[PDB]
Subunit: 313 residues, 4 copies
Amino acid sequence: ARNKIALIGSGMIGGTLAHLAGLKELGDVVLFDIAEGTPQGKGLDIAESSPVDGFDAKFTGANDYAAIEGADVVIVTAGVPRKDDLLGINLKVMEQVGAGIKKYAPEAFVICITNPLDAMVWALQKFSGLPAHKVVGMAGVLDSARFRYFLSEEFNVSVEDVTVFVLGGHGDSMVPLARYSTVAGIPLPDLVKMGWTSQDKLDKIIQRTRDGGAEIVGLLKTGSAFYAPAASAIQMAESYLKDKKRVLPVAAQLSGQYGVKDMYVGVPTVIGANGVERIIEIDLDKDEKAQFDKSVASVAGLCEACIGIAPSL
Amino acid sequence: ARNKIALIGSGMIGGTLAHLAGLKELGDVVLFDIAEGTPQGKGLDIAESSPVDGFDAKFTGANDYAAIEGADVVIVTAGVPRKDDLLGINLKVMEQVGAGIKKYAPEAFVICITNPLDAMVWALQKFSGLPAHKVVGMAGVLDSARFRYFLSEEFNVSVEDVTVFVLGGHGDSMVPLARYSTVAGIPLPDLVKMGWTSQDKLDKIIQRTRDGGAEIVGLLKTGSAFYAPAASAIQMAESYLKDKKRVLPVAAQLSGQYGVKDMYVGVPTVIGANGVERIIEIDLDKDEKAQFDKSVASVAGLCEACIGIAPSLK
Amino acid sequence: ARNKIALIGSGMIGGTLAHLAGLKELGDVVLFDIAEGTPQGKGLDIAESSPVDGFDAKFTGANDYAAIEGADVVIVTAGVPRKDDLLGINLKVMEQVGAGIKKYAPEAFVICITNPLDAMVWALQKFSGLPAHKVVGMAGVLDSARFRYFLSEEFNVSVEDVTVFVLGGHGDSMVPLARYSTVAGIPLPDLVKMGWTSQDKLDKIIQRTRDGGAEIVGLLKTGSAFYAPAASAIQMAESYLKDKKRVLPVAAQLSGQYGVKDMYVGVPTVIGANGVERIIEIDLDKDEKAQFDKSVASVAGLCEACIGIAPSLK
Amino acid sequence: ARNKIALIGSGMIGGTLAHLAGLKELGDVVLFDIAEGTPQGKGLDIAESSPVDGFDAKFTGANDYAAIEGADVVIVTAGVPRKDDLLGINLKVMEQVGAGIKKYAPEAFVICITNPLDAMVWALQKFSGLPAHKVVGMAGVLDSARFRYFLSEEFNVSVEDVTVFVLGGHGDSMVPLARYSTVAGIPLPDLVKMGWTSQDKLDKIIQRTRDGGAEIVGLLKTGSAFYAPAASAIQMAESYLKDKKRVLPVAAQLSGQYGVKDMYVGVPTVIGANGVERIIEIDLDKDEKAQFDKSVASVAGLCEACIGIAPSLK
Ligand SMILES: Nc1ncnc2c1ncn2[C@@H]1O[C@H](COP(=O)(O)OP(=O)(O)O)[C@@H](O)[C@H]1O
Ligand SMILES: Nc1ncnc2c1ncn2[C@@H]1O[C@H](COP(=O)(O)OP(=O)(O)O)[C@@H](O)[C@H]1O
Ligand SMILES: Nc1ncnc2c1ncn2[C@@H]1O[C@H](COP(=O)(O)OP(=O)(O)O)[C@@H](O)[C@H]1O
Ligand SMILES: Nc1ncnc2c1ncn2[C@@H]1O[C@H](COP(=O)(O)OP(=O)(O)O)[C@@H](O)[C@H]1O
């Protein structure tokens, strides 16, 4: 049987996941949503494109969780946009999604995209009852992609020769490690030394990565980023389906690493056929650990606020 | 230097064209639109995705035609949705687009998507002044893709083993030839004989292909198809850029084939580094010819109504 | 767990099978051979190449059949070159390979390449005991590739728009059907009618296809084709592994189709996750049927000679 | 016009270069060789494979240099195998090849593979007269692919997540910098401190990389590596053809960097549409600089012995 990918949410990211899953031949695709017509429509549009590029994949749109039965991978974008209270609405969505995955796809590898990410993934894991190593959040890969793109422009090198090291969440909760970020193995601080850029331009690049999501919103005005997010989650899915062992920053349940337990945090992980196969642990200096703890504190509060709304957690 | 692809219109199809061009490494991409922010945002979004798959391409969003200068391929989706009324607004858009291509990308291979396709490509070729062999419309490839998909489902074979032969435009203007459509070389009427499906099911499949665009609109409610249309236009672009000589049904200027001159009609064509390098003419039986003539006549009616609005087209 | 591909034989075709399996990310690859070092060397060379393109697959060389345990697909090129005595040595190889698959990969999709193909795949099925729908021979896809390529050059169209219909085996045992061969849905005889080529040039292209293997041998002098044969077998394997339902001409066990039972014959088949899922049966006119029966008769003679050598095949 | 890739030498690597150029749709390919039949045979074999995957490319075999005319990229494997009189035979070959490039493809980007690489590329640049930034040697990418592969195994991570930094040539001429080699951005010496590996294992992986070519020869017995070498050279061609700006270790002409002038040394370089666009110069500690100087001196001595065989190089 082909692999089966279920996309819970058929909006801008959802459609893009479907398209990419088709193009990359990851397998059959189920697009789920509460909106009638939307998933069916996008699913049939993508199916109808299949003969052009030559991929053979079933695309199904559905409004019933039974359609996700036996999904090897589930990618969750279901939620509402920030048009505080976002927490309350999206948490109720995670509850519906969790129960749906619990019933129909308990063996799935689950990638959460819904915001606020680190809390929503934490809640989805508990509501679904899936083992934590099989439930992760997409955030870090997106920050890393933006950062790499900015640097590839700064140095006029290939994106393929830029590596960045990122932990935490987005924005002020991101913890970049310049010293573990390189061009062809040469770390960013030495590139500054060599005159390839300046520390001020690197600081602006770092700040632009923090604000990267907001920059896209400012440009589109009517929505947020969807290509790079979608590409990011597909890469995680792909490392699972192909047992690739990529090292990828994702929101994963920590159990002692970095001094944190029972909470999702953005960390470098090795992704393979068993989900999060390994959490990578590096030393952080005082300032790094300062930012790190600050994000954990912020996410702790969101999770507590979620416990407020849903004591079942 | 890399190939340069200019996308005139940065909407649902436009953004998809850009994503596909990035993924397939067809070259650098300019997203153009009149809306500020939109092409800049989609362009940067896609650029930002590029380290994931490792493609190297520049993405630029622009609100100025000068950004398209020297484009090897121009793909046009600029226009407004249908919420003869449409004709007038989109015609004026083809005039602006035409003038920008003439000025900044005169050597471009141009692929028109804007509806109503059959008149807009013909108008766009005139306004722009480009040689007709370098200006085509995307329609046939989409209808063909839908048709093939439905057949692959009916027979449970790979999409790559289904071929269909489509003349004309969308809907009632489509003239599909079942006898030149095949699974692995076996024509559809033979597959009907062998019991692989029935004539009534084949008939419904052709009808579904006619109504294909409207089926997606009914599902989406808020807009129309964009993934299959984009994929279709990108396939045409790619045959040009790679000098592939794919046989693709496109809206092309006829000059004698099928008795038709000075008009764009959907016909299978060989697309290579010189654009429309060959239009394929087959013999039609009397019924098929009558279907083809009705479709061409309806396209001529649309073009004449464009002339009434923009006399410079005459 | 990744798919596992076992290559029984690590010569020219085998090494190409491994390379393509890596490049296309079909899974982990075991190269098996009788020669020590050859499969280990090639496997490590291809593994060392993997960081360039970024594919992650394990490559193992082995001289022990236990290495092939649990293989999803097994591709067999083991044999010796013609340097009816060939039949004898290669039948012994099929017996060893058969026993090794039976013991270690009884659930594999098995693709036979070893010559002479039509007898060897039939012998290999019997020796191995695998269900016949999981054991096929590569042949038709190669004749088909050659033919398509030659036509694509003749007409100067993309290889992607050429389809050919080929029954039987290589050389004089090939039964090509020009009428079920097309460019963009247009059968070759209509293309002759339209002036795209002549009957005499089509006849020559057909004969070139019969002689295709020998033409490569004539050029290389030291051995035979390996790129197109490897590509052809890999396509078959992918259709299985992706459940793609491609229609491919392969040597398959017939059970009534075309009046044939209990023999392997080159026929267009749908290949999916269950192996040979459908064997396509068309009607043949009187001349085509005579050509087909003559081809089947010479395959029956070859199998009878194999029974002569190895009575356990009776 | 499609890109044109000329392959000077149609042996094991040559054939593999051709196949990969086909699969990756890099352009039309000319296989050239002194041996009649070989390049025509390999060329036709690969062309015949092309309808399977659907790439459209011309493959030509030739024994006349005029076939390479206007090549965008020329990759040279022409020479004889190692069975200082090798230096003399292969130098004579570089003379012929250089003269054919000068006459027929003076604007080519040229990639040398012929051994001994460090002298042959230098000598090939001088014979052909091409600008030095357009003539490079393939070496470092190969050592780097092997290195990364061995590391990916030790750490159980994707090959895509390992980066290594290699100066100099193969074997004892290699100068690897563990401190600019990484897993996920984390340098190797730090990984040793973290317990993910030991200095012993790391030293053995370095030594294994130095002996990597000889390890493959010890396994194959009758030949040397060809898959990883071909993949490495193709990555270099591709970065040029796509203006990718990949950072790749290649043998390039230094003009002041690391204190070296008028000599080809393995250094990481930016490769784009103008060939060697930037040679990366880092600071070296005293030990690293001694290793580098010893490697460069041994390259200088080889080139001096070439000047004694062919005084025209002085
Ligand atoms: N309870 C729910 N279950 C499933 N889908 C939901 C639920 N609530 C909202 N959605 C859907 O989630 C999708 C969110 O899409 P969108 O707003 O485009 O954001 P994104 O950028 O994450 O794609 C919409 O298609 C919406 O209908
Ligand atoms: N005169 C014009 N010039 C350039 N772009 C235009 C013009 N008029 C409309 N557009 C743009 O064309 C795009 C059409 O996109 P959309 O409505 O999503 O349809 P489609 O599905 O064809 O992409 C919109 O982004 C709109 O801003
Ligand atoms: N009994 C056997 N078991 C396994 N491999 C065998 C056996 N006999 C021969 N071989 C191998 O089969 C391979 C045939 O390769 P080669 O002669 O290059 O032909 P091809 O073109 O079919 O690859 C060789 O590697 C050879 O050692
Ligand atoms: N003067 C020359 N010009 C062109 N080709 C040559 C010349 N001398 C030798 N060759 C060819 O170079 C090729 C080297 O191939 P091969 O020995 O397989 O080594 P590799 O492993 O580098 O491909 C052979 O095909 C040989 O015929």
